[PDB]
Design an enzyme around this catalytic site. Sequence first.
Site, PDB file in Angstrom:
ATOM      1  N   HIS A   1       0.820  -1.204   0.000  1.00 18.62           N
ATOM      2  CA  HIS A   1       0.000   0.000   0.000  1.00 18.62           C
ATOM      3  C   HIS A   1       0.853   1.252   0.000  1.00 18.62           C
ATOM      4  O   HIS A   1       0.498   2.244  -0.638  1.00 18.62           O
ATOM      5  CB  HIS A   1      -0.929   0.009   1.243  1.00 18.62           C
ATOM      6  CG  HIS A   1      -1.642  -1.292   1.467  1.00 18.62           C
ATOM      7  ND1 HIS A   1      -2.640  -1.749   0.631  1.00 18.62           N
ATOM      8  CD2 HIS A   1      -1.480  -2.250   2.411  1.00 18.62           C
ATOM      9  CE1 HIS A   1      -3.078  -2.917   1.066  1.00 18.62           C
ATOM     10  NE2 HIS A   1      -2.392  -3.244   2.146  1.00 18.62           N
TER      11      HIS A   1
ATOM     12  N   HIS B   1       5.500   7.069   6.595  1.00 17.64           N
ATOM     13  CA  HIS B   1       5.234   6.659   5.225  1.00 17.64           C
ATOM     14  C   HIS B   1       4.614   7.847   4.509  1.00 17.64           C
ATOM     15  O   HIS B   1       4.318   8.874   5.120  1.00 17.64           O
ATOM     16  CB  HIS B   1       4.261   5.479   5.198  1.00 17.64           C
ATOM     17  CG  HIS B   1       2.949   5.816   5.823  1.00 17.64           C
ATOM     18  ND1 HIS B   1       2.724   5.708   7.174  1.00 17.64           N
ATOM     19  CD2 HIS B   1       1.844   6.389   5.299  1.00 17.64           C
ATOM     20  CE1 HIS B   1       1.503   6.147   7.446  1.00 17.64           C
ATOM     21  NE2 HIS B   1       0.969   6.601   6.323  1.00 17.64           N
TER      22      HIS B   1
ATOM     23  N   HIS C   1       1.780   9.118   1.170  1.00 20.52           N
ATOM     24  CA  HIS C   1       0.743   8.893   0.165  1.00 20.52           C
ATOM     25  C   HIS C   1       1.032   9.849  -0.981  1.00 20.52           C
ATOM     26  O   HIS C   1       1.465  10.981  -0.745  1.00 20.52           O
ATOM     27  CB  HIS C   1      -0.653   9.186   0.716  1.00 20.52           C
ATOM     28  CG  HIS C   1      -0.947   8.427   1.966  1.00 20.52           C
ATOM     29  ND1 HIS C   1      -1.636   7.243   1.970  1.00 20.52           N
ATOM     30  CD2 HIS C   1      -0.580   8.652   3.249  1.00 20.52           C
ATOM     31  CE1 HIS C   1      -1.735   6.794   3.214  1.00 20.52           C
ATOM     32  NE2 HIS C   1      -1.068   7.615   3.988  1.00 20.52           N
TER      33      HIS C   1
ATOM     34  N   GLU D   1      -3.741  13.289   1.185  1.00 21.06           N
ATOM     35  CA  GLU D   1      -4.978  12.822   1.804  1.00 21.06           C
ATOM     36  C   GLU D   1      -5.771  13.990   2.366  1.00 21.06           C
ATOM     37  O   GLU D   1      -6.904  14.239   1.949  1.00 21.06           O
ATOM     38  CB  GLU D   1      -4.628  11.783   2.867  1.00 21.06           C
ATOM     39  CG  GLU D   1      -3.889  10.614   2.250  1.00 21.06           C
ATOM     40  CD  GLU D   1      -4.163   9.336   2.984  1.00 21.06           C
ATOM     41  OE1 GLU D   1      -3.861   9.286   4.217  1.00 21.06           O
ATOM     42  OE2 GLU D   1      -4.730   8.397   2.403  1.00 21.06           O
TER      43      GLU D   1
ATOM     44  N   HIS E   1       3.297  11.058   6.621  1.00 20.62           N
ATOM     45  CA  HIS E   1       2.667  10.768   7.905  1.00 20.62           C
ATOM     46  C   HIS E   1       3.697  10.150   8.842  1.00 20.62           C
ATOM     47  O   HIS E   1       4.242   9.079   8.555  1.00 20.62           O
ATOM     48  CB  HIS E   1       1.549   9.770   7.688  1.00 20.62           C
ATOM     49  CG  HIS E   1       0.368  10.386   7.030  1.00 20.62           C
ATOM     50  ND1 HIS E   1      -0.628   9.671   6.433  1.00 20.62           N
ATOM     51  CD2 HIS E   1       0.035  11.681   6.883  1.00 20.62           C
ATOM     52  CE1 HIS E   1      -1.529  10.484   5.927  1.00 20.62           C
ATOM     53  NE2 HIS E   1      -1.147  11.711   6.195  1.00 20.62           N
TER      54      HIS E   1
ATOM     55  N   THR F   1      -6.122   6.404   8.044  1.00 22.91           N
ATOM     56  CA  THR F   1      -6.677   6.629   6.712  1.00 22.91           C
ATOM     57  C   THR F   1      -6.634   5.386   5.839  1.00 22.91           C
ATOM     58  O   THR F   1      -7.025   5.460   4.670  1.00 22.91           O
ATOM     59  CB  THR F   1      -5.975   7.760   5.978  1.00 22.91           C
ATOM     60  OG1 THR F   1      -4.647   7.307   5.659  1.00 22.91           O
ATOM     61  CG2 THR F   1      -5.930   9.015   6.807  1.00 22.91           C
TER      62      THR F   1
END
Length: 257
Positions: free
Chosen positions: A61, A91, A93, A103, A116, A195
Amino acid sequence: HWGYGKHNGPEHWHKDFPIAKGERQSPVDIDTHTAKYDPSLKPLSVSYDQATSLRILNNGHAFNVEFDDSQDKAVLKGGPLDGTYRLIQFHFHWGSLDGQGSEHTVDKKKYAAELHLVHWNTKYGDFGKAVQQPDGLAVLGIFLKVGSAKPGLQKVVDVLDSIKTKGKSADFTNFDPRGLLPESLDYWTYPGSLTTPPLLECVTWIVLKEPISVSSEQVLKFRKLNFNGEGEPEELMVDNWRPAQPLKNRQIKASFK
Ligand SMILES: NC(=O)[C@@H](CCC(=O)O)NC(=O)c1cccc(NCCOCCNC(=O)c2ccc(S(N)(=O)=O)cc2)c1C(=O)O
Ligand SMILES: [Zn+2]
């Protein structure tokens, strides 16, 4: 299982994780005009001088840089937080294009990516017990825009070709997460959730107002990662972001006037 595709992405997650439609889900749009300055917030303290990274992992992911959280070494306190929260992993996104990937949004604006830094409340002894608590976690969120390179990110970028596919991990010691922080610690804060599944409602979100700049080349290297494992059809790891969720009965507080 869950992912970010048409058939297993965010719009599907509620079937296996019904809290997806809960009362304090993340991320949210940060309407900067309706957020209220909170003089009751104490100064935020990010104390990463003793941080000890251990490993970097492609989990299918995102990729996580994991830290040794067995002692008080890299801690977040102050601001909206009671007590001390210990860093366990970071990590990102990111998007398929520079126009999306974050996000959280800021007055509907999407950034190219979002970092994050995940911390757990030390009152609960470890991460697994903390995620059973409504104040178990604090996530420090930092937006990334594409512009100048971020020197402190390069060590992460350079290791990604060793963890291209789901399940791959690599030694990743001596990485200083302080090189990922912007100048200002001005922030917005609100109560929310993880999330990604299991979407647990444990998080005090602290989202910094000032983005960091990374170069196009750096984010392009994020986009070379794969959601799939080795020997499976290649699906580039891009657009691994959940869209903004309803604010419902929540107020966003600002640390700055
Ligand atoms: N089929 C199942 O068994 C379901 C049943 C449905 C349900 O009742 O839920 N149960 C879980 O799945 C589950 C339930 C409770 C605890 C669990 N493990 C620990 C919590 O998960 C840790 C992994 N994620 C992160 O640490 C993380 C994610 C996002 C962010 S972020 N982007 O917000 O910063 C930061 C960190 C799990 C699990 O096994 O995953
Ligand atoms: Zn995240």
